[PDB]
């Protein structure tokens, strides 16, 4: 027992509609691919979700500038 659901474009990316039968109660899931081409989604805990969300928002340019610590001795 399974359903069909739609792949669609959102922004510059791809996304899949989650029917309510399968709704997640977190905002972040782990995603991996099995040998057969199946993509598997496994939610994280709510606490891990809320903590790791704090580091969403920092792009590569920011990481570039931050990594450039140029932290010389006293």
């Amino acid at each position: 027992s399974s359903m069909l659901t739609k792949v669609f474009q959102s922004g510059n990316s791809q996304a899949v509609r989650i029917p309510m039968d399968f709704r997640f109660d977190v905002d972040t899931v782990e995603i991996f691919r099995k040998e057969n081409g199946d993509v598997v989604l496994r939610p994280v805990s709510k606490k891990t979700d809320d903590f790791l969300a704090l580091f969403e928002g920092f792009d590569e340019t920011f990481i570039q500038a931050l990594e450039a610590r140029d932290d010389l001795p006293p």
């Binding site: 920092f58 610590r69 001795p73």
Partner: protein, 134 residues
């Protein structure tokens, strides 16, 4: 206990967002506190100015610090700094100056510093640190 995220572990968290470290955070007891030094916050602001979208970066920082508060020190930071700046100068083995300030901030709080750069910080022998990557 206070747990202080250093600048490098916050870079790691932005590059690799690993579940491992989220697990260790949850283990923190109720009266515990998760924080960064004003040093690290200043480095985050620097990165905001060196990034493509400044207003975006600043909003990311503001959200981050709402949960990992920025702490500002008192005179005890200067006592640890004088002591360790002298010790390491005599050894000829100085560490980065911002890292030194960060380490002495952690000492002044009797805090645990969370870093993925243990070799540098091990030179500050009184420092409690943990690597939440390893």
């Amino acid at each position: 206990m206070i747990y202080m995220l250093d600048t490098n572990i916050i870079i790691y968290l932005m590059k690799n967002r690993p579940k491992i470290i989220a697990e260790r955070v949850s283990q923190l007891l109720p009266n515990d506190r998760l924080v960064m030094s004003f040093i690290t916050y200043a480095e985050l602001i620097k990165g905001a100015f060196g990034s493509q979208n400044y207003e975006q970066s600043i909003r990311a920082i503001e959200l981050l610090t709402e949960r990992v508060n920025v702490l500002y020190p008192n005179e005890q930071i200067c006592l640890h700094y004088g002591k360790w700046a002298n010790t390491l100068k005599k050894q000829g083995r100085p560490i980065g100056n911002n890292d030194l300030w960060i380490a002495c901030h952690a000492l002044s709080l009797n805090a645990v510093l969370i870093t993925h750069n243990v070799k540098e910080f091990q030179r500050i022998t009184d420092l409690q640190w943990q690597d939440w990557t390893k």
